[PDB]
Each structure stands twice: as structure tokens, then as C-alpha cells.
Amino acid sequence: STDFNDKILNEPLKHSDFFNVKELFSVRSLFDARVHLGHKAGCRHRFMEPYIFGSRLDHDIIDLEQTATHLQLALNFTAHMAYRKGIILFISRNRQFSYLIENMARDCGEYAHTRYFRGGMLTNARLLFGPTVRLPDLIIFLHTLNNIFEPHVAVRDAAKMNIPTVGIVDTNCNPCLITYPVPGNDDSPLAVHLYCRLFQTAITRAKEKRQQVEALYRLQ
Amino acid sequence: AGSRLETVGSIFSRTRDLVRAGVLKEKPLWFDVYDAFPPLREPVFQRPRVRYGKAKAPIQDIWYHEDRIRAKFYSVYGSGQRAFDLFNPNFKSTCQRFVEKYTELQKLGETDEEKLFVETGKALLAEGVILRR
Amino acid sequence: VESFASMLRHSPLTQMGPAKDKLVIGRIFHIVENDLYIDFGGKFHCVCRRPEVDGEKYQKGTRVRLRLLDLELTSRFLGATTDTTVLEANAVLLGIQE
């Protein structure tokens, strides 16, 4: 099993972009998807200031150059986690996109939670599912805020359970506890569709890469 | 299982310390990936603060030179009766064409703001664009 | 390579300037009885009432003329450190785009 590990689980970690996630998007594409449009300055969160290019007529604009690097890191992490067959859970309380996110999660062979988040799903999972339940290895927030404009409880719960989190953080969100924050617009349907497409493509490509690497190793 | 103190350090630091201390027998599946490709900022909890005194946000207002011209246009000729099509990535409003003509005149002539405005209006009317003051 | 600064400078939304009393083109993408949800290229959509004149013509995908009042409706209330947002724009429905 030593050769198994060294060749399959350690090989991808020696390359900067093993799954080639950089070609999935560009600053032009993000601008076309209106990823740069934030909320007005009155709703601005302090910790989101370093990611804000400026304010255009009292409307915050998200610096897409930083968004590109953050999205690259988040997509690389997601692809690597999917390559290792980790359980990936998408979370979003924006009811306008619940159907899309559930369809995407079903498509890429991952899991979704777009419904009311009950107390203790993560911190009390053994009582709520069973003593031998396996929790997610990665949680992806397409919307980090609930419907009262406060952080989704799952962010703090995942931080408590030491589960890495990827997250789309708008100008009025708190990125302190999200492991891989991606500053961008989370309201416009174009941006959400782009995020879903990128994450689904990355996960599918990672799983296919794992399968073909295993096949090659078995053949040789 | 790991520590549930989400406000102390980060998940990476807590997991690393518990693994080295022997509390956790094996590293989680994500530890190696995090170590190889860390985030730009370590995810450490911080309490947001309200600013007081002269402390101000460092966010700047986005302004361009042409905005001045736009303002004057929107103050003189008003909002164009033609509607904006924001879906088109290369939409050109009447104000935008006025701005481009103004800049071309400035680069090909002298700098007198009123004269540039009036001659730009003459040029646009010559091209055949209606402009009601 | 085009930088983000150039994109923002030459964006139609940036060129529009102030959004008050500006005529824009929107597209109907959702209908709930007589409530039409219209996207006009901004961060948020606007909810308009179906006009009593030629109301049948207003269907999904229809192009409509709007007079923008606010791109996002927000308001700071007493005892609040942050603005409260409705996550919608304010616009007036003028008619259909011929």
C-alpha cells in the first residue's frame, strides 16, 4: 500500500495545478458573469474591505484580480478533495437557487443542503444520523448568509468540527472563518450559475482523473 | 475527534497540534491538501469592530475624468430618450459618444471646457444625432 | 491582456453613471400571477406589477422598458449599525420594447 499511496495520493500534491483548474475561468468571464457587483457601502462588512476595489456611486465593486486568485485556490482545493473521494456538501439558503444547486450536486455525485438547517446536524451528527455516520470532508457555501442576513450556522459548526470550508463571500459577509473565501457576487443568477458550473466541472474532472490514474496504475 | 474551539487558532493549527500531541491517531483527509496548497489567509476568528473617532474605511470612490463631462451632459441635454441596454457588453449611449467626441477634440485641439462642449454638440448634430437641451 | 480596471472603466453600467431616472431595457425571467420579475443587467432584479393595458403581452422573455430609481433599496434604521436591504431594485414599468 506504500506504493499505492506514494503514486496516487501523493503524486497530485507535487504539482501546482494538477487538475488544470486555471483554464476554467478568466477575469473576463467573471466580469461577464457580474461577479464584481457588490452591495452598497451601507451594508459593507469590515473584513471584506481588503477585497473591495472601490465604491462606484455608493455601490461596492469587488476586485476581480483578487477573486481570480481566491477562486483558483478554492477550485484547486475542491478538485484535490474530490480526487481523494471526500464527501462534498454544498450549502445555500437562497431559495432562488435551491433547485439549481440540488441538480448540480446530484449531477457531480456530491451532496446538497439547501433547506432549513436544523440544530446539531454537524455537531450532533451521531445522534441525528447514527453512531457510524461519516461527515463531509469539504463544505462549499454558495451563500454564506441565511435569510435574516446573519452568518449561516453551518460556518461555525464546520469550524467546530474541523471541516474545511470554501465560500462565496459578498461585500456584506464575514470571511473570517471560511477556509478558502472567494470574494464575489452571490445574488445575480449569472454569477451563481458560473460558480455552480465551475465547481461541478472541477469535481467531475477530479473524479475522472482519479479513475484513470487508478486504471493506469493497475495496468502497469 | 478534534477540538471544537473554533475561536482559538484555525482548523489547521488545531488539527496539527492535536496530531503532534497524539490525541488524533491519523490526520484528516484534507490535512495534506491544506498543507500543500494553503489559503492566502489563515482562517482565524476575529470579532468585527465598530470604528470611532477619525478612523475611516480605506475604500475609495471610483471616479474618471469623463464623469465630469457625463455630469454636464446629463445636466444640459438630460437623460437620453434612447434606453440603455446593459446586456450588450459594447453598448454605446449618446452620452458615451459625446464623451468620446469630447476627448478626441481635446486631444486634437485646445482645452476650453465650454468651447469643447459646444463644438462637440455641433459635431454630434452634424453626424445626425438629435440632442434636445 | 485587458485588466479589470479597463473592464470597469468601459463597462456600460459604469458609463451609465447615476441610476436615477435612467431608461433601461429589462427582460422578464419569472412571473408570479401579476408580479413580473425583470432583470436589467444589474446586481438585483426588479418586481413590477402587470400593467392593465396589454397585460397579456407581458410574458417570460419579453423585453420591457424601465425607468430606474434605485439599483438596490436599502435603509438604515434606528439602533442599527448596518443597512437593511430588500435585495431588489426599484424601477417603473413603462411598456414593451417594440
Binding site: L57 | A71 | S3, P18
Partner: peptide, 25 residues
């Protein structure tokens, strides 16, 4: 980069509202 924003007072700032008797004795 020439496309970067420049520091400037708001050119779209509307004139501040006046009462009906402002400027009159």
C-alpha cells in the same frame, strides 16, 4: 495604468435643497 480611478469630488452631486425663501430678505 491609465484606466485606474482618480481622486475627485462627486461630479454628480445634486445641488443641496433650498427653502422657498432662501436668498430673500
Amino acid at each position: 495604468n491609465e484606466d485606474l480611478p482618480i481622486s475627485m469630488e462627486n461630479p454628480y452631486k445634486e445641488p443641496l435643497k433650498k427653502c422657498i425663501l432662501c436668498g430673500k430678505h
